C-alpha cells in the first residue's frame, strides 16, 4: 500500500487509441462453458 523504489502498482492501463495498429487494438472477448452431469439438463435449445 505504498509507492516508491522496490514498490510496484499492479494495475497498469491500456491506452486504447484508434491511432494504434491492429496489433494493439482492443478486443471484446466472451467465453462459454459446458459440462455433463447427473441431474437432468436444462440449457437444451435443440432442433426444429
Amino acid at each position: 500500500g505504498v509507492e516508491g523504489f522496490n514498490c510496484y502498482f499492479p494495475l497498469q492501463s491500456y491506452g486504447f487509441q484508434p491511432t494504434n495498429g491492429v496489433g494493439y487494438q482492443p478486443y471484446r472477448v466472451v467465453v462459454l462453458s459446458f459440462e455433463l452431469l447427473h441431474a437432468p439438463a436444462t440449457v437444451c435449445g435443440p432442433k426444429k
Partner: antibody
Amino acid sequence: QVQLVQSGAEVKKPGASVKVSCKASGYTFTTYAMHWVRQAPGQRLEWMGWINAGNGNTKYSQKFQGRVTITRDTSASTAYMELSSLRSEDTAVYYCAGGGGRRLQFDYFDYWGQGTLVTVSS
Amino acid sequence: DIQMTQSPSTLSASVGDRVTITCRASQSISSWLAWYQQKPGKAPKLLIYDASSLESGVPSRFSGSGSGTEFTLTISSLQPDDFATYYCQQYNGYPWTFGQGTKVEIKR
C-alpha cells in the same frame, strides 16, 4: 452516501497562483476518480482534468495544458488543484467531481462538490 | 475536438406535462453521453449516463434515448423539482465538452 466538500472563497490578482482542494469521504477507495471541472459565470462548463486517486495518473486538458497541476494526499483523502498565470477570464466557480465506486473509472461526474468561487481582479 | 450544441436554448412548459431536449454532435458519438441537472446557485446533479441508463436515486420520470448523433431526454409528468437547466456531456473522445444550457420555465 459519498459526499465531497472543499475550501471557501478566494480572491487573487493577475499572474498569481491559487490552490483549491476538496476532501473525500467514500466507503471504499477502489481507484477513486477526483475529477475537476470549472464554470465561467453564465457560460458553458469547462473540464479541467482527472487525477487517478488510485495512484498518480494525471491526464489533463489541452486548452489548459502546461499551466495547471493536480495532486492528492492519500492520508487526508483530499484532492489538490493548482493553476498559475491566471488572468481576468478564469474568474469562475470551481468544482470537484468523480467517485465511480462500482467500476474503477468513468468519464461522467456523479459526485459533485458544492462549488468554489474564484475571482481574478486587479 | 468534439463540438456539442443544444437545439433548445430555453424550453417553456407547465406543471404536469412532458418535455423533450435535443443534443446534436458535430461528429459521430457511439451513445456516449450523460445529462446533468443544475439548479441556480447549486452543484450539478447527474441524471442519465451512456445515453440510456437511469442512475439511481432519481425520479422514474426521466428517460433517455437516441444514438449516433441526435440524442434525446424526456420526462412524462412535469414536477416542480424539474425547474432548472439541463446539460449534455459528450464523452466519445478527448477533451470532454458540454452543451449550452436548456432552461425550463413556468408558463402563465
